[PDB]
C-alpha cells in the first residue's frame, strides 16, 4: 500500500464533473475544481487544467495525471510549511502518508489548524492524538474516512485500508 493507493481508495475516481461531500465541483481522483456554484466556472477551470476543450469529461490518464500533480503538490506544500514540516519529518513512512492524505483533503491551512493534534503526533503520543483528531468538524462530516486516517496515525500500519 502507498499514498496513491490510499487516496485512490478515499477519493474514488470519476470521469465527469461531480460535486464533492461539501457540494463543490470536482473531477477525477478528488481534484477540486472550484468552490463557485457555477458549473460553467467549473468547466472552465477544467479545460484550463487539462489544456483542451473537455466539455466536463476527461479520460483515465488525464485523471491520473491531475492526481500525480495533486500528490506532488501536497508533499511539496508540507515541506514548505513551517508548521507542518517538522511534524512530517518526525514521522515514520506510514504515518507520513496519513498526514499527506489529510493535506490533500483539507489543504495545508486546514491541517495547520490541528495544532494540538500535530504536537501530539510529534511527541509520538498516538492514542491521545487519535482522540484529539476526532474532536473536529473533519471527523463529524466524513467519519468513515476520518477513522481510516486516524487508525493509521494510531497504529502506524495500513490495517484500516486492508
Ligand atoms: Cl491544475
Ligand atoms: Cl466518510
Curated annotation (Swiss-Prot):
Induction, per UniProt: Expressed late in the viral replication.
Cellular compartment(s): Host cytoplasm
Effect on the protein of changing residue 117 to F: 10-fold decrease in enzymatic activity
Active site (catalytic residues): 11 (proton donor/acceptor), 20 (proton donor/acceptor)
InterPro entries linked to this entry: Endolysin_T4_type, Glyco_hydro_24, Lysozyme-like_dom_sf, Lysozyme_dom_sf, Phage_lysozyme-like, T4-type_lysozyme
EC number: 3.2.1.17
Keywords: Antimicrobial, Bacteriolytic enzyme, Cytolysis, Glycosidase, Host cell lysis by virus, Host cytoplasm, Hydrolase, Viral release from host cell
Positions contributing to substrate binding: 32, 104, 117, 132
GO annotation terms (biological process): cell wall macromolecule catabolic process; defense response to bacterium; peptidoglycan catabolic process; viral release from host cell by cytolysis
Gene Ontology CC: host cell cytoplasm
EC category: hydrolase
Record's keyword annotation contains Hydrolase: yes
Classification via Pfam families: Phage_lysozyme
Superkingdom of source: Viruses
Stored SUPFAM superfamilies: Lysozyme-like
pH dependence statement: Optimum pH is 7.3.
Signal peptide: none
Reaction(s) the record says it catalyses: Hydrolysis of (1->4)-beta-linkages between N-acetylmuramic acid and N-acetyl-D-glucosamine residues in a peptidoglycan and between N-acetyl-D-glucosamine residues in chitodextrins
A Gene Ontology molecular function term of the record: lysozyme activity
Listed result of changing residue 30 to A: Almost complete loss of enzymatic activity
Function: Endolysin with lysozyme activity that degrades host peptidoglycans and participates with the holin and spanin proteins in the sequential events which lead to the programmed host cell lysis releasing the mature viral particles. Once the holin has permeabilized the host cell membrane, the endolysin can reach the periplasm and break down the peptidoglycan layer.
HAMAP family registered for this protein in UniProt: ENDOLYSIN_T4 (MF_04110)
UniProt similarity note: Belongs to the glycosyl hydrolase 24 family.
Protein's UniProt name: Endolysin
Organism: Enterobacteria phage T4
Amino acid at each position: 500500500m502507498n499514498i496513491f493507493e490510499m487516496l485512490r481508495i478515499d477519493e474514488g475516481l470519476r470521469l465527469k464533473i461531480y460535486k464533492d461531500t461539501e457540494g463543490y465541483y470536482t473531477i477525477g481522483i478528488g481534484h477540486l475544481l472550484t468552490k463557485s456554484p457555477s458549473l460553467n466556472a467549473a468547466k472552465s477551470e477544467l479545460d484550463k487544467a487539462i489544456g483542451r476543450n473537455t466539455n466536463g469529461v476527461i479520460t483515465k490518464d488525464e485523471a491520473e495525471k491531475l492526481f500525480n500533480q495533486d500528490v506532488d503538490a501536497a508533499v511539496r506544500g508540507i515541506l514548505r510549511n513551517a508548521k507542518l514540516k517538522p511534524v512530517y519529518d518526525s514521522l515514520d513512512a506510514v504515518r507520513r502518508a496519513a498526514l499527506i492524505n489529510m493535506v490533500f483533503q483539507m489543504g495545508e491551512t486546514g491541517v495547520a489548524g490541528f495544532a494540538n493534534s500535530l504536537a501530539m503526533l510529534q511527541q509520538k503520543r498516538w492514542d491521545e492524538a487519535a482522540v484529539n483528531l476526532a474532536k473536529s468538524r473533519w471527523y463529524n462530516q466524513t467519519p468513515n474516512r476520518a477513522k481510516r486516517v486516524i487508525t493509521t496515525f494510531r497504529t502506524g500500519t495500513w490495517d484500516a485500508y486492508k
